[PDB]
């Protein structure tokens, strides 16, 4: 059982990038962090910026949540991102993408100790 921290590392992190350089990105990346196993994960955002930075957020601008809970934070700063969501014409188990790389803050859900994002809210 991989904990909800850890989840969110493996659908959210891509720090080894400082930006997608191609529009096949989403298409590569959601496959090898294993989102397209059972199902096409339909909309998915990957974050370019060093775990520490992405877990600093947890201490920053405290919003609502969009399910109303009170848990989520917005980053003080913008962050480079990749956004990936699924084309109309994409049929599991061929899933594709439309890339689209960007710079926006980030709102993530924190919960635990120690308190780390364990979920991916939105960009802004």
Do not use: W
Not at 3 to 32: G, I
Not at 57 to 68: H, L, T, Y
Not at 73 to 88: A, F, V
């Amino acid at each position: 059982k991989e904990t909800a921290a850890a989840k969110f590392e493996r659908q959210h992190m891509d720090s080894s990038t400082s930006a997608a350089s191609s529009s096949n990105y989403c298409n590569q990346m959601m496959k090898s962090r294993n989102l397209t196993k059972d199902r096409c994960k339909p909309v998915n955002t990957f974050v370019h910026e060093s775990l520490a930075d992405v877990q600093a957020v947890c201490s920053q601008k405290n919003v609502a949540c969009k399910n109303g809970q009170t848990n989520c934070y917005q980053s003080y700063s913008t962050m480079s991102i990749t956004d990936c969501r699924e084309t109309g014409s994409s049929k599991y188990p061929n899933c594709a993408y439309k890339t689209t790389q960007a710079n926006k803050h980030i709102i993530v859900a924190c919960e635990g100790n120690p308190y780390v994002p364990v979920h991916f809210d939105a960009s802004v």
